[PDB]
Write a protein that binds this ligand. Structure first.
Ligand SMILES: Cc1cc2nc3c(=O)[nH]c(=O)nc-3n(C[C@H](O)[C@H](O)[C@H](O)COP(=O)(O)OP(=O)(O)OC[C@H]3O[C@@H](n4cnc5c(N)ncnc54)[C@H](O)[C@@H]3O)c2cc1C
Ligand SMILES: Cc1ccc([C@@H](C)Oc2cc3onc(CCC(=O)O)c3cc2Cl)nn1
Length: 448
C-alpha cells in the first residue's frame, strides 16, 4: 500500500485523506488544532461558507454531499440592501437546482473528519508542522507546549492553509516563484441572532449584501436563523482620501457602532453585540498568492489555500480547494509514480487556480458598486434567452458548472466584450440589432 502524510485536516486535507484511504493508501493526517469533535465547554464562533457546485460535486464523489447538505441552508439568490428601498432579491439561477448552500465550517469539518476516519485515515491532532528535511525525508511537528516529534514521510501533502508551513519548507529547496499581492481590505465577523433576524424579517434563504463602494457587508444564514455578517473595510485610509472609512479610524466598538448607524442604518439594529464582536473578534487579512510550481519532485505537493490563497469575493476558496482534492487523489491514484502525478496535477490545476484568483478579484466591484451596465445586462438576458447553451453568465459558469475556471473566464471575457461592444453608441434596446449580436454569440461561443 502507498503511503502519504497530509498536513492540515482542513477542507482539502480531510477530503483528499478520505479519497486516498478508501483507495487503500496508508494515510496519516496531522492537524495543529484540537479535534473539534471533542466537545468542550468553549464558546467558539460560527463561520459560514457558501458551498457551490464545484465543492458539492467533490463531496458527491466522496459520498458526503447528502450529509453536508442536510446541515446547509439553501441560498436561492442575492438580496441587495440599499437604505430606503425594500431588499431586492436577484435569483442566482433558473430554479432550485441552481442555488448555493450556506454551511457552518465546524459542521462541515466534523463530517469530513468522520469521513476520512471511516475510509481508514489516521488523524493526529494538536501537532503543527515546524520543518521538513527533504533530503532525509523527515519532518518535525510540535504541540502547543513546544515538545517536538519527528516523523519519516514518503509523500507529503501540504493542505495546511493560506500560511502553509509545507509551502514555507518547499520554498527552501525549490524556487516556488511566489508573488504575493496584498489586498487593502481587512475583515471583521459580526453576528445577527435568530431573534433579531426574525424581528427584522431578514430572508433566511438568500445571501445578503450591503454594498457601499469601497466597503461592504455580506451575511450568510445558519440553520437556526442566526447570520454571520462579514464587514470588508480598508485596513488604513489611503493618502489621497484620508477621511475615507477604515479599520484604523474605528478605535473601539463604540466607533464601530457609530460607523454602522451612519453607513449601514438598516443593518446596525440587527447587530445586538456589535460593540463586543468588534472588540473581541480580530481584524482578518486578505491576499492573493500565486506560485509558479506546487511541488518538489515526487516528494511534496500543495493544494487549496496552501497552493493558491485568493481574495474571498467569489466565495470560491473552499470550492476550488475541494475540486483540487479530487484532482490530486485522481492523479496520485493512476500515475506511474508520485513525481509524474504531482507534475500532472500542477499542470492541470495551476491555470484554473490563476483564473479563479483573477475572477475573485474582479467580483468585488460586481458586489459593492449604472446606466450603460443595465443596457449590457438587458442585452445579455435576451442573448441568454435566445442562446442558453452558449451565453451563460460568468457567475453561473463559476458557481453552477464544473467547466475549468480558465474556460469560464475565457467565455466570460468573450461575453463581456460582446455586450460592451454591442451597446456602444446606442441609447436603448430598440436601436440594437438583436440578430446581429446573436450571430456573434453563435460565431464566438460554442455550445456546452
Ligand atoms: C471566515 C471565512 C469564510 C469563508 N467563506 C468562504 C465561502 O463562502 N466560500 C468559499 O468557497 N470559501 C470561503 N472561504 C475560503 C475557504 O475557507 C478556504 O479557501 C478553504 O478552507 C481552503 O481549504 P484548505 O483545506 O486549503 O485550507 P483550510 O480549510 O484553512 O485548512 C488548513 C488546515 O491546516 C491546518 N494547519 C495550518 N498550519 C498547520 C501546520 N503548520 N501544521 C498542521 N496543521 C496546520 C489548519 O489548522 C487547518 O485545519 C472562507 C474563509 C474564511 C476564513
Ligand atoms: C475571510 C472571508 C470572510 C468571509 C468570506 C465569505 C463569507 O465571503 C463571501 C462569500 C461569498 O459566497 N459567494 C459570494 C459571491 C456572491 C455574489 O456575487 O452574489 C461571496 C462573497 C464573499 Cl465576500 N470569505 N472569506
Amino acid at each position: 500500500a502507498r503511503q502519504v502524510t497530509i498536513i492540515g485536516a482542513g477542507l482539502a486535507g480531510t477530503l483528499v485523506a478520505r479519497l486516498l484511504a478508501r483507495n487503500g493508501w496508508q494515510v496519516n493526517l496531522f492537524e495543529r488544532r484540537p479535534d473539534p469533535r471533542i466537545e468542550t465547554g468553549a464558546r467558539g464562533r460560527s463561520i459560514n461558507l457558501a458551498l457551490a457546485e464545484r465543492g458539492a460535486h467533490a463531496l458527491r464523489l466522496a459520498g458526503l454531499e447528502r450529509e453536508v447538505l442536510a446541515e446547509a441552508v439553501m441560498m436561492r439568490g442575492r438580496m441587495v440592501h440599499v437604505p430606503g428601498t425594500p431588499p431586492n432579491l436577484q435569483p442566482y439561477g433558473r430554479d432550485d437546482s441552481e442555488v448555493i448552500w450556506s454551511i457552518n465550517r465546524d459542521r462541515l469539518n466534523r463530517i469530513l473528519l468522520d469521513g476520512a476516519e471511516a475510509a481508514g485515515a489516521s488523524i493526529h491532532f494538536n501537532l503543527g508542522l515546524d520543518s521538513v528535511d527533504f533530503a532525509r525525508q523527515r519532518l518535525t511537528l510540535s504541540n502547543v507546549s513546544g515538545e517536538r516529534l519527528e516523523k519519516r514521510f514518503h509523500l507529503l501533502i501540504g493542505a495546511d492553509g493560506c500560511n502553509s508551513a509545507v509551502r514555507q519548507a518547499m520554498a527552501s529547496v525549490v524556487d516556488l516563484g511566489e508573488h504575493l499581492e496584498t489586498q487593502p481590505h481587512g475583515y471583521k465577523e459580526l453576528q445577527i441572532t435568530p431573534e433579531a433576524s426574525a424581528q427584522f424579517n431578514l430572508e433566511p434563504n438568500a445571501l445578503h449584501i450591503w454594498p457601499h463602494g469601497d466597503y461592504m457587508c455580506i451575511a450568510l444564514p445558519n440553520l437556526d436563523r442566526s447570520f454571520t455578517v462579514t464587514l470588508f473595510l480598508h485596513h488604513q485610509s489611503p493618502a489621497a482620501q484620508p477621511a475615507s472609512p477604515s479599520f484604523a479610524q474605528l478605535v473601539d466598538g463604540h466607533a464601530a457602532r457609530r460607523f454602522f448607524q451612519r453607513q449601514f442604518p438598516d443593518l446596525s439594529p440587527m447587530l445586538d453585540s456589535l460593540e463586543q464582536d468588534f472588540e473581541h473578534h480580530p481584524t482578518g487579512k486578505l491576499a492573493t498568492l500565486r506560485l509558479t510550481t506546487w511541488h518538489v519532485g515526487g516528494q511534496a505537493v500543495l493544494l487549496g489555500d496552501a497552493a493558491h490563497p485568493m481574495v474571498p469575493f467569489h466565495g470560491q476558496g473552499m470550492n476550488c480547494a475541494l475540486e483540487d482534492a479530487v484532482a490530486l487523489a485522481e492523479h496520485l491514484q493512476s500515475a506511474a509514480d508520485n513525481a509524474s502525478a504531482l507534475a500532472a496535477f500542477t499542470a492541470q490545476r495551476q491555470p484554473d487556480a490563476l483564473a479563479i484568483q483573477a475572477m475573485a478579484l474582479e467580483n468585488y466591484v460586481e458586489m459593492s458598486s449604472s446606466p450603460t451596465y443595465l443596457l449590457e445586462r438587458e442585452l445579455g438576458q435576451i442573448m441568454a434567452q435566445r442562446q442558453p447553451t452558449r451565453f451563460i453568465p460568468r457567475y453561473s459558469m463559476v458557481t453552477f458548472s464544473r467547466l475549468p475556471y480558465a474556460q469560464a473566464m475565457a467565455r466570460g471575457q468573450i461575453q463581456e466584450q460582446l455586450l460592451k461592444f454591442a451597446v456602444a453608441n446606442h441609447s436603448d434596446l430598440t436601436s440594437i440589432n438583436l440578430d446581429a449580436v446573436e450571430h456573434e454569440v453563435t460565431r464566438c461561443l460554442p455550445p456546452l
